[PDB]
Amino acid sequence: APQQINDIVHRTITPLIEQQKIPGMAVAVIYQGKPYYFTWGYADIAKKQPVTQQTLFELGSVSKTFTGVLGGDAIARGEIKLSDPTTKYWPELTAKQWNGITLLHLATYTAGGLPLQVPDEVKSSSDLLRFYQNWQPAWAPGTQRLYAGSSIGLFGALAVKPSGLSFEQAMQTRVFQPLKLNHTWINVPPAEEKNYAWGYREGKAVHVSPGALDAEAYGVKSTIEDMARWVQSNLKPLDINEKTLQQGIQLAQSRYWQTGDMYQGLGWEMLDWPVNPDSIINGSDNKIALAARPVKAITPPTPAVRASWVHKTGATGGFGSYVAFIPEKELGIVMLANKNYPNPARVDAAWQILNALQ
Ligand SMILES: *C(=O)[C@](NC(=O)Cc1cccs1)(OC)[C@@H]1N=C(C(=O)O)C(=C)CS1
């Protein structure tokens, strides 16, 4: 019953905010098809603007879930295949290392060591091309997983090319609108500026900066309500009336690669439920999560497994986000904060809450 929810959430999150000195935070728990919302603190400290259910947070790397699903939808539409070579979409990518790198590799960080970020010196499309052309792999395609915004980013930009739409147009018309995420943005419009929290880094108020392939890797700003709706859409894709979008959501939770007890989806990462909590909490530390690891191909990919812990962490310089959910149990959580605090604290809090509700 809802008292269970309130009790575990309050007991769990109030110490976390105190320990991590989080200025503002929004949490949603999704339980049996219903969301339950909790907010604390300030969206803007200087102006004493409180966090509310309409406050926008930067998702950072959680945006990659949207990118994964938008790709999944382009696959379902027959516009692209994950088996296609990158060069089919960017024929200017002629350097020899691109021979053998597929869209699957890009989408799943397995191209052979594309880096965590696109370098800050890349400001133009010619700078981008030069970057990928000069890039030297460390491993053969499909052999090591190295978590990389420059990999999934490129996938995003390539995956929308056949549509004829920009990445933002594709995401708005094919994902945001059908799911009725009407307070979810890649570019925040004037009507929402008042709701857009500041991030806090070493005490300074900050917003994410423009960057190459930002829309694709870390584009999205959203509210706790819309994120709870994103979680629900991903927990229960069969309720989605748009067929290609339903299928895309399912494709993003297919298991493509395994490393240790983790399975790579498109954006999403997955473990079998029940999980070992120490494995996901410690696994979330950047020392571990950003390290290169050999992967085993799952040939062919396993379709979305209901008994999974499905999750993704995200950060910008000012923001820390986490989404997890367990489809078999109709259970999930969203944690949005306007400080970047360590991932294991997010994941530990989330597990404490969801495990209690299972
Ligand atoms: C995902 O969260 C991450 N970064 C972002 O999404 C957005 C940015 C963070 C800093 C500038 S943009 O991968 C793309 C995280 N980035 C970092 C990083 O600082 O490079 C991490 C240490 C974890 S993954």
Coordinates of C-alpha atoms and ligand atoms in Angstrom, one line a residue:
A1 CA 0.0 0.0 0.0
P2 CA 1.2 3.6 -0.5
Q3 CA 2.3 4.0 3.1
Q4 CA 5.2 1.5 2.3
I5 CA 6.2 3.8 -0.5
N6 CA 6.2 7.0 1.5
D7 CA 8.0 5.5 4.4
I8 CA 10.8 4.0 2.4
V9 CA 11.2 7.0 0.2
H10 CA 11.4 9.5 3.0
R11 CA 13.7 7.4 5.2
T12 CA 16.0 6.8 2.2
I13 CA 16.2 10.2 0.4
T14 CA 16.3 12.6 3.3
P15 CA 19.7 11.3 4.6
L16 CA 21.0 11.1 1.0
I17 CA 20.2 14.8 0.5
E18 CA 21.9 15.6 3.8
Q19 CA 25.0 13.5 3.2
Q20 CA 25.5 14.7 -0.4
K21 CA 24.5 18.3 0.2
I22 CA 22.1 18.2 -2.6
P23 CA 20.3 21.5 -3.1
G24 CA 17.3 20.2 -5.0
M25 CA 15.9 16.8 -5.8
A26 CA 12.9 15.1 -7.3
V27 CA 12.0 11.4 -7.0
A28 CA 9.3 9.4 -8.6
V29 CA 8.4 5.8 -7.7
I30 CA 6.3 3.9 -10.2
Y31 CA 4.4 1.1 -8.6
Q32 CA 1.8 -0.9 -10.4
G33 CA 1.2 1.6 -13.1
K34 CA 1.0 4.6 -10.8
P35 CA 3.6 7.3 -10.1
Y36 CA 4.3 8.7 -6.7
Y37 CA 6.2 12.0 -6.5
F38 CA 8.5 13.6 -3.9
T39 CA 10.4 16.8 -4.1
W40 CA 12.8 18.7 -1.9
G41 CA 14.9 21.9 -1.9
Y42 CA 15.6 24.5 -4.4
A43 CA 15.8 24.6 -8.2
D44 CA 17.5 28.0 -7.9
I45 CA 19.2 28.8 -4.6
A46 CA 19.8 32.5 -5.2
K47 CA 16.1 33.1 -6.1
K48 CA 14.7 30.6 -3.6
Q49 CA 12.8 28.9 -6.4
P50 CA 11.6 25.5 -5.0
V51 CA 11.9 22.2 -6.8
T52 CA 8.5 21.2 -8.1
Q53 CA 6.9 18.5 -10.3
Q54 CA 7.4 20.8 -13.3
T55 CA 11.1 21.6 -12.6
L56 CA 13.4 20.6 -15.5
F57 CA 16.6 18.8 -14.8
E58 CA 19.5 18.0 -17.1
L59 CA 19.5 14.2 -17.7
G60 CA 23.0 13.9 -18.9
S61 CA 23.8 10.4 -20.0
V62 CA 20.2 9.3 -19.3
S63 CA 19.5 11.0 -22.6
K64 CA 21.1 7.9 -24.2
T65 CA 18.0 5.9 -23.3
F66 CA 16.0 8.3 -25.5
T67 CA 18.6 7.9 -28.2
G68 CA 18.5 4.1 -27.9
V69 CA 14.8 4.0 -28.2
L70 CA 14.8 6.5 -31.2
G71 CA 17.3 4.2 -33.0
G72 CA 15.1 1.2 -32.1
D73 CA 12.2 3.0 -33.7
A74 CA 14.2 3.7 -36.9
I75 CA 15.1 0.1 -37.0
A76 CA 11.3 -0.9 -36.7
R77 CA 10.5 1.6 -39.4
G78 CA 13.0 -0.2 -41.7
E79 CA 15.1 3.0 -42.1
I80 CA 18.3 1.5 -40.8
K81 CA 19.6 -1.8 -39.6
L82 CA 22.1 -2.3 -36.7
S83 CA 24.0 -4.6 -39.0
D84 CA 24.6 -1.9 -41.5
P85 CA 28.2 -0.5 -41.8
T86 CA 28.7 3.1 -40.4
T87 CA 30.0 4.0 -43.9
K88 CA 26.6 3.3 -45.4
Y89 CA 25.5 6.5 -43.6
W90 CA 28.7 8.5 -43.6
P91 CA 30.6 7.6 -46.7
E92 CA 33.2 10.3 -46.0
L93 CA 34.4 8.1 -43.3
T94 CA 37.0 6.4 -45.5
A95 CA 39.8 5.6 -43.1
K96 CA 40.5 1.9 -43.0
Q97 CA 39.6 1.4 -39.3
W98 CA 35.9 2.1 -40.2
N99 CA 35.7 -1.0 -42.3
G100 CA 33.8 -3.5 -40.1
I101 CA 32.3 -0.9 -37.6
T102 CA 28.5 -1.3 -37.7
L103 CA 25.7 0.8 -36.3
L104 CA 25.4 -1.9 -33.6
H105 CA 29.0 -1.2 -32.5
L106 CA 28.3 2.5 -32.2
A107 CA 25.1 2.1 -30.3
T108 CA 26.7 -0.3 -27.8
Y109 CA 30.2 1.2 -27.2
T110 CA 31.9 -1.8 -29.0
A111 CA 33.5 0.0 -32.0
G112 CA 36.9 -0.5 -30.5
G113 CA 37.7 2.3 -28.1
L114 CA 35.9 5.5 -29.2
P115 CA 36.4 7.9 -26.4
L116 CA 34.1 8.9 -23.5
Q117 CA 33.5 12.4 -24.9
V118 CA 33.9 14.1 -28.2
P119 CA 36.9 16.5 -27.7
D120 CA 36.0 20.0 -26.7
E121 CA 38.0 21.4 -29.7
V122 CA 35.4 19.9 -32.1
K123 CA 33.1 22.7 -33.0
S124 CA 32.2 22.0 -36.7
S125 CA 31.1 19.1 -38.9
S126 CA 34.5 19.1 -40.6
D127 CA 36.2 19.0 -37.1
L128 CA 33.9 16.0 -36.4
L129 CA 34.8 14.2 -39.5
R130 CA 38.6 14.8 -38.9
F131 CA 38.2 13.5 -35.3
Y132 CA 36.6 10.1 -36.4
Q133 CA 38.9 9.7 -39.3
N134 CA 42.0 10.2 -37.2
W135 CA 40.7 8.2 -34.3
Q136 CA 42.8 5.1 -33.7
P137 CA 41.1 2.0 -32.2
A138 CA 42.6 0.0 -29.4
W139 CA 40.7 -3.2 -30.2
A140 CA 38.9 -4.9 -33.2
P141 CA 35.2 -4.1 -33.6
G142 CA 32.9 -6.1 -31.4
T143 CA 35.4 -7.2 -28.9
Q144 CA 35.6 -4.6 -26.0
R145 CA 33.0 -2.4 -24.5
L146 CA 34.2 1.1 -23.6
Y147 CA 31.5 3.4 -22.5
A148 CA 31.5 6.4 -24.8
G149 CA 29.3 9.3 -25.6
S150 CA 31.2 9.8 -28.9
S151 CA 30.0 6.3 -30.0
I152 CA 26.3 6.4 -29.1
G153 CA 26.3 10.1 -30.1
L154 CA 27.4 9.2 -33.6
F155 CA 24.9 6.4 -33.8
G156 CA 22.1 8.9 -33.0
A157 CA 23.1 11.3 -35.6
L158 CA 23.4 8.6 -38.3
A159 CA 20.3 6.8 -37.3
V160 CA 18.0 9.8 -38.2
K161 CA 19.6 10.5 -41.6
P162 CA 17.2 8.4 -43.6
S163 CA 14.2 10.1 -42.0
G164 CA 15.2 13.4 -43.5
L165 CA 14.5 15.0 -40.0
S166 CA 17.0 16.7 -37.6
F167 CA 17.8 14.6 -34.5
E168 CA 15.6 17.0 -32.4
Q169 CA 12.7 16.8 -34.9
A170 CA 12.9 13.0 -35.0
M171 CA 13.1 12.7 -31.2
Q172 CA 10.2 15.2 -30.7
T173 CA 7.9 13.8 -33.3
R174 CA 8.7 10.1 -32.8
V175 CA 9.3 9.7 -29.1
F176 CA 8.3 12.8 -27.0
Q177 CA 4.9 13.5 -28.7
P178 CA 3.6 9.9 -28.9
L179 CA 4.4 9.3 -25.3
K180 CA 3.0 12.7 -24.3
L181 CA 6.2 13.9 -22.8
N182 CA 5.2 17.5 -23.1
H183 CA 7.8 18.9 -20.6
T184 CA 10.7 17.2 -22.1
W185 CA 13.1 19.1 -24.3
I186 CA 16.5 19.1 -26.1
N187 CA 16.3 22.9 -26.4
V188 CA 14.4 24.5 -23.6
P189 CA 11.8 27.0 -24.9
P190 CA 11.0 30.4 -23.3
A191 CA 7.9 29.1 -21.7
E192 CA 10.0 26.7 -19.7
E193 CA 12.9 28.9 -18.7
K194 CA 11.3 29.6 -15.3
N195 CA 11.2 25.9 -14.5
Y196 CA 14.7 25.0 -15.7
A197 CA 16.7 24.3 -12.5
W198 CA 20.3 25.5 -12.1
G199 CA 22.9 22.8 -11.5
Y200 CA 25.4 23.4 -8.7
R201 CA 29.1 22.6 -9.1
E202 CA 31.5 23.7 -6.4
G203 CA 28.7 26.1 -5.4
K204 CA 28.5 27.9 -8.8
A205 CA 25.1 27.8 -10.7
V206 CA 25.7 26.1 -14.1
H207 CA 23.9 24.8 -17.1
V208 CA 25.3 22.3 -19.6
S209 CA 27.3 23.9 -22.4
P210 CA 26.8 23.4 -26.2
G211 CA 28.9 20.6 -27.6
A212 CA 29.4 18.4 -30.7
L213 CA 26.6 15.6 -30.6
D214 CA 25.2 16.9 -27.4
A215 CA 21.6 16.4 -28.5
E216 CA 22.5 12.8 -29.2
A217 CA 24.5 11.8 -26.1
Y218 CA 23.3 14.3 -23.4
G219 CA 20.5 16.4 -24.9
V220 CA 17.5 15.9 -22.8
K221 CA 16.0 18.1 -20.0
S222 CA 12.9 16.7 -18.4
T223 CA 10.6 16.9 -15.4
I224 CA 10.0 14.2 -12.7
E225 CA 6.5 13.6 -14.2
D226 CA 7.6 13.1 -17.8
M227 CA 10.5 10.9 -16.5
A228 CA 8.0 8.8 -14.6
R229 CA 6.0 8.5 -17.8
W230 CA 9.3 7.5 -19.7
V231 CA 9.8 4.8 -17.1
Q232 CA 6.3 3.5 -17.5
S233 CA 6.5 3.4 -21.3
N234 CA 9.7 1.4 -21.0
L235 CA 8.3 -0.9 -18.3
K236 CA 5.2 -1.7 -20.4
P237 CA 5.8 -1.0 -24.1
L238 CA 2.8 -3.1 -25.2
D239 CA 0.5 -0.3 -24.0
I240 CA 2.1 2.0 -26.6
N241 CA -0.3 2.4 -29.6
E242 CA 2.5 3.6 -32.1
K243 CA 3.7 0.1 -33.4
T244 CA 7.3 1.2 -34.4
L245 CA 7.8 3.0 -31.2
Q246 CA 6.5 0.0 -29.2
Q247 CA 8.9 -2.2 -31.1
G248 CA 11.8 0.3 -30.6
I249 CA 11.4 0.3 -26.9
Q250 CA 11.6 -3.5 -27.0
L251 CA 14.7 -3.4 -29.2
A252 CA 16.5 -1.1 -26.7
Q253 CA 16.1 -3.7 -24.0
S254 CA 17.4 -6.6 -26.1
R255 CA 20.6 -8.0 -24.7
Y256 CA 23.4 -7.5 -27.3
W257 CA 26.6 -8.0 -25.3
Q258 CA 27.4 -9.4 -21.9
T259 CA 30.2 -8.3 -19.6
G260 CA 30.3 -9.8 -16.1
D261 CA 26.7 -9.8 -14.9
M262 CA 25.6 -6.8 -17.1
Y263 CA 24.0 -6.8 -20.5
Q264 CA 24.2 -3.9 -22.9
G265 CA 21.0 -2.7 -24.5
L266 CA 20.6 0.4 -26.8
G267 CA 21.0 3.1 -24.1
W268 CA 19.7 0.9 -21.4
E269 CA 21.8 -1.5 -19.4
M270 CA 20.3 -4.7 -17.9
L271 CA 21.0 -7.2 -15.2
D272 CA 19.0 -10.2 -14.2
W273 CA 16.7 -9.6 -11.3
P274 CA 17.2 -10.3 -8.4
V275 CA 20.5 -8.5 -8.6
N276 CA 23.5 -8.6 -6.2
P277 CA 23.2 -5.0 -4.9
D278 CA 26.9 -4.6 -4.3
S279 CA 27.5 -5.5 -7.9
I280 CA 25.3 -2.7 -9.2
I281 CA 26.3 -0.2 -6.6
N282 CA 30.0 -0.7 -7.0
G283 CA 29.7 -1.3 -10.7
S284 CA 28.3 2.1 -10.9
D285 CA 31.4 3.9 -9.7
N286 CA 33.1 5.5 -12.6
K287 CA 36.4 3.7 -12.0
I288 CA 34.5 0.5 -13.0
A289 CA 31.7 1.6 -15.3
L290 CA 34.1 3.6 -17.6
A291 CA 36.8 0.9 -17.9
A292 CA 37.2 -1.1 -21.1
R293 CA 36.0 -4.6 -20.7
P294 CA 35.9 -7.6 -23.1
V295 CA 32.4 -8.4 -24.2
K296 CA 30.7 -11.7 -25.3
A297 CA 28.4 -11.3 -28.2
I298 CA 24.9 -12.5 -27.7
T299 CA 24.2 -14.2 -31.0
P300 CA 21.4 -13.5 -31.7
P301 CA 20.4 -10.9 -29.1
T302 CA 18.1 -12.0 -26.4
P303 CA 14.8 -10.3 -26.4
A304 CA 13.9 -8.1 -23.5
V305 CA 13.8 -10.1 -20.4
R306 CA 11.0 -9.2 -17.9
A307 CA 13.0 -10.2 -14.8
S308 CA 15.7 -7.5 -15.3
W309 CA 17.0 -4.6 -13.4
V310 CA 17.1 -2.1 -16.2
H311 CA 18.9 1.2 -15.5
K312 CA 21.1 4.1 -16.5
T313 CA 23.1 6.8 -14.6
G314 CA 23.6 10.3 -16.0
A315 CA 25.5 13.5 -15.0
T316 CA 26.3 16.9 -16.3
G317 CA 28.6 19.3 -14.5
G318 CA 25.7 20.4 -12.3
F319 CA 23.2 17.5 -12.3
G320 CA 23.0 13.9 -11.2
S321 CA 20.3 11.5 -12.6
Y322 CA 19.3 7.9 -12.2
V323 CA 16.5 5.7 -13.6
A324 CA 16.0 2.0 -12.8
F325 CA 13.1 -0.3 -13.3
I326 CA 12.1 -3.9 -13.1
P327 CA 9.5 -4.9 -15.7
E328 CA 8.3 -8.2 -14.1
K329 CA 7.4 -6.2 -11.0
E330 CA 5.9 -3.1 -12.6
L331 CA 8.3 -1.1 -10.4
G332 CA 10.7 1.7 -11.1
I333 CA 12.3 4.9 -9.8
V334 CA 13.5 8.2 -11.1
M335 CA 16.0 10.3 -9.1
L336 CA 16.8 13.8 -10.4
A337 CA 19.1 16.2 -8.5
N338 CA 20.8 19.5 -9.3
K339 CA 24.2 18.5 -8.1
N340 CA 26.5 15.8 -9.5
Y341 CA 27.0 13.4 -6.6
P342 CA 28.5 9.9 -6.8
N343 CA 26.7 7.2 -8.7
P344 CA 27.0 4.5 -6.0
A345 CA 25.0 6.7 -3.6
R346 CA 22.2 7.0 -6.3
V347 CA 22.1 3.3 -7.0
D348 CA 22.3 2.3 -3.3
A349 CA 19.3 4.6 -2.5
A350 CA 17.4 3.3 -5.5
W351 CA 18.0 -0.4 -4.7
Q352 CA 17.0 0.3 -1.0
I353 CA 13.7 1.7 -2.3
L354 CA 12.8 -0.8 -5.0
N355 CA 13.9 -3.8 -3.1
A356 CA 11.7 -2.7 -0.2
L357 CA 8.7 -2.5 -2.6
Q358 CA 9.2 -5.7 -4.6
Ligands
LIG1 C1 26.9 10.8 -19.0 O1 26.4 11.2 -18.0 C2 28.3 11.2 -19.4 N1 28.2 12.7 -19.6 C3 27.1 13.3 -20.0 O2 26.1 12.8 -20.3 C4 27.1 14.8 -20.1 C5 28.3 15.5 -19.6 C6 29.1 15.5 -18.5 C7 30.2 16.4 -18.6 C8 30.1 17.2 -19.7 S1 28.8 16.7 -20.7 O3 28.8 10.5 -20.6 C9 28.6 11.2 -21.8 C10 29.1 11.1 -18.2 N2 30.3 11.9 -18.3 C11 31.3 11.9 -17.6 C12 32.4 12.9 -17.9 O4 32.6 13.8 -17.1 O5 33.0 12.9 -19.0 C13 31.5 11.0 -16.5 C14 32.6 11.0 -15.7 C15 30.5 9.8 -16.4 S2 29.6 9.5 -17.9

